[PDB]
Design an enzyme around this catalytic site. Sequence first.
Site, PDB file in Angstrom:
ATOM      1  CG  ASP A  43      -2.008   1.080   1.193  1.00  0.00           C
ATOM      2  OD1 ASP A  43      -2.987   0.956   0.371  1.00  0.00           O
ATOM      3  OD2 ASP A  43      -1.921   2.052   1.986  1.00  0.00           O
ATOM      4  CE1 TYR A  48       1.394   9.270   5.290  1.00  0.00           C
ATOM      5  CE2 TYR A  48       0.903   7.412   3.853  1.00  0.00           C
ATOM      6  CZ  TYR A  48       0.595   8.195   4.954  1.00  0.00           C
ATOM      7  OH  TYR A  48      -0.518   7.965   5.724  1.00  0.00           O
ATOM      8  CE  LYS A  77      -4.964   5.238   1.176  1.00  0.00           C
ATOM      9  NZ  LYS A  77      -3.791   4.372   1.412  1.00  0.00           N
ATOM     10  CG  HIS A 110     -11.139  11.394   0.961  1.00  0.00           C
ATOM     11  ND1 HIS A 110     -11.245  12.752   1.142  1.00  0.00           N
ATOM     12  CD2 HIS A 110     -12.111  10.833   1.727  1.00  0.00           C
ATOM     13  CE1 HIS A 110     -12.184  13.006   2.047  1.00  0.00           C
ATOM     14  NE2 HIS A 110     -12.741  11.863   2.400  1.00  0.00           N
ATOM     15  CB  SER A 185      -4.640   2.203  11.763  1.00  0.00           C
ATOM     16  OG  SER A 185      -3.870   3.260  11.184  1.00  0.00           O
ATOM     17  N   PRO A 186      -4.548  -1.560  11.371  1.00  0.00           N
ATOM     18  CG  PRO A 186      -3.627  -3.454  10.412  1.00  0.00           C
ATOM     19  CD  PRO A 186      -3.602  -1.963  10.310  1.00  0.00           C
ATOM     20  N   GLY A 188      -4.499  -0.505  15.523  1.00  0.00           N
ATOM     21  CA  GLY A 188      -4.971   0.689  16.283  1.00  0.00           C
ATOM     22  C   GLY A 188      -4.005   1.868  16.271  1.00  0.00           C
ATOM     23  CB  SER A 226       6.316  -3.727  11.331  1.00  0.00           C
ATOM     24  OG  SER A 226       7.299  -3.968  12.316  1.00  0.00           O
ATOM     25  CB  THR A 227      10.603   0.006  10.912  1.00  0.00           C
ATOM     26  OG1 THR A 227      10.465   0.180  12.305  1.00  0.00           O
ATOM     27  CG2 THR A 227       9.887   1.173  10.283  1.00  0.00           C
ATOM     28  NE  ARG A 231       7.609  -4.609  16.296  1.00  0.00           N
ATOM     29  CZ  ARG A 231       8.541  -4.490  17.269  1.00  0.00           C
ATOM     30  NH1 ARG A 231       8.697  -5.428  18.209  1.00  0.00           N
ATOM     31  NH2 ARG A 231       9.327  -3.422  17.291  1.00  0.00           N
TER      32      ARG A 231
HETATM   33  N1  LIG Z   1       3.381  -7.613  15.265  1.00  0.00           N
HETATM   34  C1  LIG Z   1       3.369  -6.479  15.969  1.00  0.00           C
HETATM   35  N2  LIG Z   1       3.309  -6.473  17.362  1.00  0.00           N
HETATM   36  C2  LIG Z   1       3.347  -5.289  17.984  1.00  0.00           C
HETATM   37  N3  LIG Z   1       3.407  -4.066  17.400  1.00  0.00           N
HETATM   38  C3  LIG Z   1       3.457  -4.007  16.026  1.00  0.00           C
HETATM   39  C4  LIG Z   1       3.421  -5.228  15.253  1.00  0.00           C
HETATM   40  N4  LIG Z   1       3.510  -4.859  13.942  1.00  0.00           N
HETATM   41  C5  LIG Z   1       3.551  -3.551  13.915  1.00  0.00           C
HETATM   42  N5  LIG Z   1       3.536  -3.043  15.151  1.00  0.00           N
HETATM   43  C6  LIG Z   1       3.537  -1.626  15.548  1.00  0.00           C
HETATM   44  O1  LIG Z   1       2.229  -1.066  15.320  1.00  0.00           O
HETATM   45  C7  LIG Z   1       2.333   0.304  14.985  1.00  0.00           C
HETATM   46  C8  LIG Z   1       1.581   0.459  13.662  1.00  0.00           C
HETATM   47  O2  LIG Z   1       0.237   0.115  13.957  1.00  0.00           O
HETATM   48  P1  LIG Z   1      -0.903   0.495  12.808  1.00  0.00           P
HETATM   49  O3  LIG Z   1      -0.560  -0.389  11.639  1.00  0.00           O
HETATM   50  O4  LIG Z   1      -2.190  -0.045  13.539  1.00  0.00           O
HETATM   51  O5  LIG Z   1      -0.934   2.009  12.671  1.00  0.00           O
HETATM   52  C9  LIG Z   1       3.820   0.618  14.833  1.00  0.00           C
HETATM   53  O6  LIG Z   1       4.231   1.415  15.941  1.00  0.00           O
HETATM   54  C10 LIG Z   1       4.533  -0.696  14.813  1.00  0.00           C
HETATM   55  O7  LIG Z   1       5.822  -0.679  15.482  1.00  0.00           O
HETATM   56  P2  LIG Z   1       7.053  -1.356  14.770  1.00  0.00           P
HETATM   57  O8  LIG Z   1       7.335  -0.545  13.536  1.00  0.00           O
HETATM   58  O9  LIG Z   1       8.140  -1.175  15.861  1.00  0.00           O
HETATM   59  O10 LIG Z   1       6.870  -2.818  14.460  1.00  0.00           O
HETATM   60 CL   LIG Z   2      -2.512  13.112  -2.279  1.00  0.00          CL
END
Ligand SMILES: Nc1ncnc2c1ncn2[C@@H]1O[C@H](COP(=O)(O)O)[C@@H](O)[C@H]1OP(=O)(O)O
Ligand SMILES: [Cl-]
Length: 257
Positions: A43, A48, A77, A110, A185-186, A188, A226-227, A231
């Site tokens: 995505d 950005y 998007k 949008h 943001s699955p 949160g 995630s970075t 994860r």
């Molecule tokens: N498997 C995971 N367990 C816990 N936190 C996660 C996981 N994958 C991603 N995140 C964290 O969730 C946030 C993004 O959430 P969203 O997708 O709901 O906005 C980021 O801060 C990311 O941190 P990180 O980059 O250190 O993995």
């Molecule tokens: Cl745009």
Amino acid sequence: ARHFVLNTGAKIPSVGLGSWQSDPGVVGNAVYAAVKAGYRHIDCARVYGNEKEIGLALKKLFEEGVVKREDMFITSKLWNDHHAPEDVPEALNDSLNDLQLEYLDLYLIHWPFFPATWGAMEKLYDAGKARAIGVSNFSSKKLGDLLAVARVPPAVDQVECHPGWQQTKLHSFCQSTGVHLTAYSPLGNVLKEPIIISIAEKLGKTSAQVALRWNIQMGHSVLPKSTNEERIKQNLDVYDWSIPDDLLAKFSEIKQA
Ligand SMILES: Nc1ncnc2c1ncn2[C@@H]1O[C@H](COP(=O)(O)O)[C@@H](O)[C@H]1OP(=O)(O)O
Ligand SMILES: [Cl-]
């Protein structure tokens, strides 16, 4: 499967890497790590300012034979509020050049909201520049308004959806209409929700895995970001197990934001 099927017939992998802005290289490195781990869905968003970086990561993957273009599902998007419908094809053209692609699998828009902005989207669909077209952040009412007038109905409505923000109305409306719901943001902090921690313990999975799996079981694709390489891998480990119906039902008791 590891995919849903859109109203176009196209397969959308159930898990994608979400879009965000970070320091130089960080997103490209995530894209690369994600695809190496098995992700087939990326995505992107021109807002950005990082679609060239993502294009560099995709280019590497393709040159290295990690994946073929046809096995990737790439989404971009546009946030077009208060801009001309004529800007739409230009922005898509720019995203294609930056990503170094000939087509997008999905283009989302949008605008505040027959709408000429949607008309511009339909033309890109007809041309095959966007194999599917959709919207971002449309409520049920607005999605229904659009469905009532569109020639090409939206394939996707991409919205914030997670256990603390379950989008119950929109989920029901998407299911009845055939529009696919993609959860951004699955994750949160909903990972500290005791109901989630408990299910995770009962199933021998992490809190994130549970949260992702819950969305998948509602028929939604998910865009975890995630970075962290581990994860990244864990966020794909949502297929060879399921949440049983009795535990799935406990999600209804989670407080909404
Ligand atoms: N498997 C995971 N367990 C816990 N936190 C996660 C996981 N994958 C991603 N995140 C964290 O969730 C946030 C993004 O959430 P969203 O997708 O709901 O906005 C980021 O801060 C990311 O941190 P990180 O980059 O250190 O993995
Ligand atoms: Cl745009």
